[PDB]
């Protein structure tokens, strides 16, 4: 039974470690939308230049 459950630790330590990158890939794609601010947006609404 001890060997039963440490053999279940290994999927859950990997499945957690799989989702760590898949979280951060969303974060990297959120940083593109992050990149312009509140007033960068307001700078765009004026048709200046």
């Amino acid at each position: 039974q001890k060997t039963e459950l440490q053999s279940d630790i290994d999927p859950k330590t990997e499945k957690r470690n799989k989702l760590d990158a898949d979280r951060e890939k969303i974060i990297e794609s959120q940083d593109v939308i992050r990149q312009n601010n509140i007033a960068d947006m307001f700078k765009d609404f004026i048709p200046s230049a």
Binding site: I27, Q30, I33, R34, N37, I38, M41, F42
Partner: protein, 53 residues
């Protein structure tokens, strides 16, 4: 009568076998996990309010 000498050695064995050096590392894993969410939700609230205006 249970012996006083093993009753001390029973508790002294219990004080060595403890998860306290592990659970503190386990709880500081979850706090540093949940801080990453809070540090992400500040980015969200600073973005949606930017969108909401």
């Amino acid at each position: 009568a249970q012996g006083l000498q093993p009753q001390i050695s029973s508790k002294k064995k219990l004080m060595d076998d403890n998860n306290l050096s592990t659970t503190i590392k386990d709880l500081q894993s979850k706090i540093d996990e949940k801080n990453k969410e809070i540090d992400q939700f500040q980015k969200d609230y600073n973005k949606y309010v930017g969108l909401a205006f």
